[PDB]
Structures are given as structure tokens and as C-alpha cells.
Design a protein around this ligand. Structure first.
Ligand SMILES: O=P(O)(O)O[C@H]1[C@@H](OP(=O)(O)O)[C@H](OP(=O)(O)O)[C@@H](OP(=O)(O)C(F)(F)P(=O)(O)O)[C@H](OP(=O)(O)O)[C@H]1OP(=O)(O)O
Ligand SMILES: [Cl-]
Ligand SMILES: [Cl-]
Ligand SMILES: [F-]
Ligand SMILES: [Mg+2]
Ligand SMILES: [Mg+2]
Ligand SMILES: [Mg+2]
Ligand SMILES: [Mg+2]
Length: 134
């Protein structure tokens, strides 16, 4: 069930999934609609779902990782697609081999150095590239 803010923007949550506390490598996943494109794992909040809970849940479903939830980075709007995303830090401590989106849609995941993550996000996902600007 999709949920919305009072202005009609779709509510989403995402994590910057870092390999370690040094925050030098981040995990991206392939797009479901376009599999040669990279995105930050995230998705819609469910009804009455805390943003931090949605963020951890979506990363588990899309990226097959668990870890230590850190800071809220910020709340980011995409004006073109009318959605508003709470973005958290997650320090990955568990990498599971066969996760919901790998099994169901063959979603891929890869570690990127921060500067390379920004590069691959810029063309189609400039707001997600901006998650890293802080
Ligand atoms: O993360 P979500 O908010 O679920 O985004 C999910 C959907 O949302 P929904 O599940 O249909 O509500 C996106 O559609 P909208 O951009 O919200 O229309 C999808 O966006 P699209 O409709 O393809 C787009 F934004 F118009 P494009 O990326 O083609 O410019 C998004 O696809 P991406 O993977 O490319 O972000 C999808 O992601 P996924 O299928 O990997 O979950
Ligand atoms: Cl790291
Ligand atoms: Cl976006
Ligand atoms: F989802
Ligand atoms: Mg979704
Ligand atoms: Mg998603
Ligand atoms: Mg999802
Ligand atoms: Mg979802």
C-alpha cells in the first residue's frame, strides 16, 4: 500500500548502506524497470510505518543486507516524480546470499566508492547523487 504526505508526494525511505564506519564504499542496486542502471536501495513507507523501519525493511528486501542504523541524513524531494524520501546511514554487518529481490526479479547489488556512486547516479537519479553531498 503506497502512502503520501499531505501535499500528495509519495512517502519513501532509503539507506546509504556503507561497508564500514569509514563510509568510503556504499552498496547500490540495479533498477527493476532498467537493469543496466544503478539506484540507492529504498521504497515506499507502509501505513503508520516509522521512516527508520521502512528504510531498514526496504534495504533488506532490495539489497539483501542488514546492519546498524545510523543518522538520518535528510529528507529529499524529487519534484519530477512527486516523492519525498527519508535517507538514513546504515553500516552493513550482514550480507545475505539469496534475498527477496534477487529471488523474485534478479536484482543485482555492487559496492561503489562514494565518488563512483555519485557518478553512476547522476544521469537518471541526480537527487540520489545529492544524498552523498552532506
Ligand atoms: O523505490 P520505489 O519508490 O518503489 O520506486 C519504484 C516505483 O515506485 P512504485 O513502487 O511504482 O510506487 C517508481 O515509480 P514512480 O517513479 O514512483 O512512478 C519507479 O520509477 P519509474 O516509474 O521507473 C521512473 F521514475 F519514472 P524512471 O526511474 O523510469 O524515470 C522506480 O524505478 P527505479 O528503480 O528506476 O527508481 C521503482 O523502483 P523499484 O521498481 O526498483 O522499486
Ligand atoms: Cl566503507
Ligand atoms: Cl530520486
Ligand atoms: F518495495
Ligand atoms: Mg517500492
Ligand atoms: Mg524501491
Ligand atoms: Mg522496494
Ligand atoms: Mg516497497
Amino acid at each position: 500500500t503506497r502512502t503520501y504526505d499531505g501535499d500528495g508526494y509519495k512517502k519513501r525511505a532509503a539507506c546509504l548502506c556503507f561497508r564500514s564506519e569509514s563510509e568510503e564504499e556504499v552498496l547500490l542496486v540495479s533498477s527493476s524497470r532498467h537493469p543496466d542502471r544503478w539506484i540507492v536501495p529504498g521504497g515506499g513507507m507502509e501505513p503508520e510505518e516509522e521512516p527508520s523501519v521502512a528504510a531498514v525493511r526496504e534495504v533488506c528486501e532490495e539489497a539483501g543486507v542488514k546492519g546498524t542504523l545510523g543518522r538520518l541524513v535528510g529528507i529529499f524531494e524529487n519534484q519530477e516524480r512527486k516523492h519525498r524520501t527519508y535517507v538514513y546511514v546504515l553500516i552493513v554487518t550482514e550480507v545475505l546470499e539469496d534475498w527477496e529481490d534477487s529471488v523474485n526479479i534478479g536484482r543485482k547489488r555492487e559496492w561503489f566508492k562514494i565518488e563512483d556512486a555519485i557518478k553512476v547516479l547522476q544521469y537518471h537519479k541526480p537527487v540520489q547523487a545529492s544524498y552523498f553531498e552532506t
